Enzyme design. Structure first.
Site, mmCIF file in Angstrom:
data_model
loop_
_atom_site.group_PDB
_atom_site.id
_atom_site.type_symbol
_atom_site.label_atom_id
_atom_site.label_comp_id
_atom_site.label_asym_id
_atom_site.label_seq_id
_atom_site.Cartn_x
_atom_site.Cartn_y
_atom_site.Cartn_z
ATOM 1 N N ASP A 75 -8.739 8.887 -18.920
ATOM 2 C CA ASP A 75 -9.442 9.572 -17.828
ATOM 3 C C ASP A 75 -9.090 11.050 -17.726
ATOM 4 O OD1 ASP A 75 -11.120 9.878 -15.564
ATOM 5 O OD2 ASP A 75 -9.447 9.477 -14.203
ATOM 6 N N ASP B 273 -5.998 11.411 -10.670
ATOM 7 C CA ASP B 273 -6.761 10.174 -10.568
ATOM 8 C C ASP B 273 -6.018 9.013 -11.232
ATOM 9 O OD1 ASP B 273 -9.059 8.885 -9.609
ATOM 10 O OD2 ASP B 273 -10.141 9.172 -11.506
ATOM 11 N N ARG C 279 -7.115 1.410 -13.125
ATOM 12 C CA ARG C 279 -8.435 1.494 -13.734
ATOM 13 C C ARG C 279 -8.522 2.587 -14.808
ATOM 14 N NH1 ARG C 279 -9.312 4.824 -8.932
ATOM 15 N NH2 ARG C 279 -10.501 6.660 -9.618
ATOM 16 N N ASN C 280 -7.607 3.560 -14.756
ATOM 17 C CA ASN C 280 -7.617 4.691 -15.691
ATOM 18 C C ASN C 280 -6.515 4.599 -16.746
ATOM 19 O OD1 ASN C 280 -9.901 5.925 -14.547
ATOM 20 N ND2 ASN C 280 -8.650 6.931 -12.983
HETATM 21 C C1 LIG Z 1 -15.043 -0.305 -21.530
HETATM 22 C C2 LIG Z 1 -14.113 -0.999 -22.463
HETATM 23 N N1 LIG Z 1 -13.297 -0.273 -23.220
HETATM 24 C C3 LIG Z 1 -12.453 -0.881 -24.074
HETATM 25 N N2 LIG Z 1 -11.583 -0.094 -24.897
HETATM 26 C C4 LIG Z 1 -11.662 1.345 -24.870
HETATM 27 N N3 LIG Z 1 -10.836 2.039 -25.766
HETATM 28 C C5 LIG Z 1 -11.028 3.460 -25.609
HETATM 29 C C6 LIG Z 1 -11.983 3.690 -24.585
HETATM 30 C C7 LIG Z 1 -12.407 5.088 -24.165
HETATM 31 O O1 LIG Z 1 -13.032 5.240 -23.134
HETATM 32 N N4 LIG Z 1 -12.029 6.171 -25.032
HETATM 33 C C8 LIG Z 1 -12.401 7.506 -24.705
HETATM 34 C C9 LIG Z 1 -13.430 8.082 -25.426
HETATM 35 C C10 LIG Z 1 -14.151 7.342 -26.521
HETATM 36 C C11 LIG Z 1 -13.803 9.415 -25.100
HETATM 37 C C12 LIG Z 1 -13.150 10.098 -24.087
HETATM 38 C C13 LIG Z 1 -12.126 9.513 -23.375
HETATM 39 C C14 LIG Z 1 -11.745 8.182 -23.696
HETATM 40 CL CL1 LIG Z 1 -10.494 7.431 -22.837
HETATM 41 S S1 LIG Z 1 -12.557 2.340 -23.934
HETATM 42 C C15 LIG Z 1 -12.392 -2.293 -24.191
HETATM 43 C C16 LIG Z 1 -13.231 -2.984 -23.386
HETATM 44 N N5 LIG Z 1 -13.232 -4.372 -23.435
HETATM 45 C C17 LIG Z 1 -14.415 -5.054 -23.020
HETATM 46 C C18 LIG Z 1 -14.087 -6.346 -22.358
HETATM 47 N N6 LIG Z 1 -13.224 -7.157 -23.180
HETATM 48 C C19 LIG Z 1 -13.814 -8.204 -24.064
HETATM 49 C C20 LIG Z 1 -14.122 -7.821 -25.454
HETATM 50 O O2 LIG Z 1 -15.226 -8.016 -25.914
HETATM 51 C C21 LIG Z 1 -12.053 -6.458 -23.641
HETATM 52 C C22 LIG Z 1 -12.382 -5.149 -24.272
HETATM 53 N N7 LIG Z 1 -14.099 -2.327 -22.516
#
Ligand SMILES: Cc1nc(Nc2ncc(C(=O)Nc3c(C)cccc3Cl)s2)cc(N2CCN(CCO)CC2)n1
Length: 263
Positions: free
Chosen positions: A156, A138, A142-143
């Site tokens: 992902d 995948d 996006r990932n």
């Molecule tokens: C959805 C999202 N995630 C961001 N950073 C992440 N870092 C790690 C992520 C993640 O999922 N870890 C993970 C976990 C925890 C478990 C299993 C597997 C995994 Cl991989 S998500 C930043 C972001 N932004 C929002 C919008 N913007 C404005 C700012 O306010 C910039 C920032 N939005």
């Protein structure tokens, strides 16, 4: 022996806000402060409310798999919370979120060398995964997640237009089908997140690829980078470069930047 996810004391975690939602559950940003260590920002993933035992097991499996990986271009696992409810997975917090979104919000803002640097990072993470006999299946912008310093990391752990023809037609997923996908990611990066094949339908894409069509260079894309995309999209999977070759080729372009002149 295999690695595993470390248990984190729940008192060390402070959840600040929800930053994403999905069918699986949600992701939050927060802070992790362990005695004797500096505070860091983290991402915190949880399962949907009311999860079953089976769902809890399948969840803590994404964590155990992630715990096997320790590379600068693969998302870093901090640990898990399992002694308390609800169960959580904790990773480093990537400040700029997903690569597709990030580029679309910053269209035209980076230099070719910066973009190539992002691609080299992704390639390095994929070389590491493939070294370990993992197949992502995948791989897409996006990932990929991006931090404040523009470091890109694979996350992902069928999207037709990212998928190798043999993986679609024969369900054969290998590192070589990941290389096809990587080529599509290269195109996404150099186009600042355009949709591969634009308004073409999935059916149209499948037929066109079989007839030998391949995506053109994105606007202002160096020919050397597009040629590498074309290598990744060789019809026969055995004809595609390996991830180590991809990284080596990107390193050579970065070391010899005049090679990026021809567009
Ligand atoms: C959805 C999202 N995630 C961001 N950073 C992440 N870092 C790690 C992520 C993640 O999922 N870890 C993970 C976990 C925890 C478990 C299993 C597997 C995994 Cl991989 S998500 C930043 C972001 N932004 C929002 C919008 N913007 C404005 C700012 O306010 C910039 C920032 N939005």
């Amino acid at each position: 022996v295999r690695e595993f996810a470390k248990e984190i004391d729940a008192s060390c975690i402070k959840i600040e806000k929800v930053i994403g939602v999905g069918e699986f559950g949600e992701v939050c940003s927060g802070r992790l402060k362990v005695p004797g260590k500096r505070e860091i920002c983290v991402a915190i993933k949880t399962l949907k409310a009311g999860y079953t035992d089976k769902q809890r097991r399948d969840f803590l499996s994404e964590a155990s798999i992630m715990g096997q990986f320790d590379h600068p271009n693969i998302i870093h696992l901090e640990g898990v919370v399992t002694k308390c409810k609800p169960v959580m997975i904790i990773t480093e917090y990537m400040e700029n979120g997903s690569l597709d979104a990030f580029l679309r919000k910053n269209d035209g803002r980076f230099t070719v060398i910066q973009l190539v640097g992002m691609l080299r990072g992704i390639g390095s993470g994929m070389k590491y995964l493939s070294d370990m006999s993992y197949v992502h299946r995948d791989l897409a912008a996006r990932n990929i997640l991006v931090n404040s310093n523009l470091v890109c990391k694979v996350s992902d752990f069928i999207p037709i237009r990212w998928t190798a023809p043999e993986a679609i037609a024969y369900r054969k997923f290998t590192s070589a089908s990941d290389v096809w996908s990587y080529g599509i990611v290269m195109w996404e990066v150099m186009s600042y997140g355009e949709r591969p094949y634009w308004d073409m339908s999935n059916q149209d894409v499948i037929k066109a690829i079989e007839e030998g069509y391949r995506l053109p260079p994105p606007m202002d894309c160096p020919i050397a980078l597009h040629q590498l995309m074309l290598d990744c999209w060789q019809k026969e999977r055995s004809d595609r470069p390996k991830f180590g070759q991809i990284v080596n080729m990107l390193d050579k372009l970065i070391r010899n930047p005049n090679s990026l002149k021809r567009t």
